[PDB]
Write a protein that binds this ligand. Sequence first.
Ligand SMILES: C=CC[N+]1([C@H]2C[C@H]3[C@@H]4CC[C@H]5C[C@H](O)[C@@H](N6CCOCC6)C[C@]5(C)[C@H]4CC[C@]3(C)[C@H]2OC(C)=O)CCCC1
Lengths: 122, 110
Amino acid sequence: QVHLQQSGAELLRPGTSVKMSCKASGYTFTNYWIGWTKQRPGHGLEWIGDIYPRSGYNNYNEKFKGKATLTADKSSSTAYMQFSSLTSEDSAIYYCARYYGSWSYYYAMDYWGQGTSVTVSS
Amino acid sequence: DIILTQDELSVTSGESVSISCRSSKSLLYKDGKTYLNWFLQRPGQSPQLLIYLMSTRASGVSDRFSGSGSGTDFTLEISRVKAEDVGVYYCQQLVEYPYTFGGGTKLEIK
Ligand SMILES: C=CC[N+]1([C@H]2C[C@H]3[C@@H]4CC[C@H]5C[C@H](O)[C@@H](N6CCOCC6)C[C@]5(C)[C@H]4CC[C@]3(C)[C@H]2OC(C)=O)CCCC1
């Protein structure tokens, strides 16, 4: 069955970087877009960015363009998200998810990871 | 950015309910498609997809769920509400960058 397995909870100091993983199984990783979402209490869901693993094409919500870096390793079917310059506002659950559709068009996140909890504290 | 507005809070089991999502702008794209999605986030779980392109039920989703809309008003209809439908319902648009979500509407059964 389709599965997106995300890495475990992180507790980090302000100004550090984190790199979290999203390992895909049960479908062809290079045929679908992956995107990342941020969920904090009081702020519902926010879109961070998408990547098309086959091509490495990535694009961002302007407000995360400074902060988030998306990559994909085709050989391990793993997507990564790196966050630099962590602040207390980065304390959130982060999801990865696959999009229904193809390469030239997609419609919605159809299979979701379980979320990675990042907590930023001094 | 496109703003999607939902009430924070929405019932007895078996009743019908609907969730409203109001867009600041038309979500119709030049291809005639409306890039509006509905997700359910059950308590302590990841979001799950219900509806895409405003009115297409995703594979494996109960036909109790249906989506409609017109102009800037969108509706998720739920027939015969069940315990498994409890959670937060989010709308989302993919017609313009950045992609944006509604604030979520919480559904509880009494
Ligand atoms: C329906 C409209 C909404 N948007 C469009 C914008 C669309 C993109 C425009 C640029 C394209 C370049 C190239 O041809 C393709 N690349 C695939 C990756 O490898 C490199 C080649 C497809 C490409 C990235 C498109 C994919 C689908 C894109 C995101 C569409 O969005 C969706 C959800 O389908 C427009 C504004 C917001 C996004």
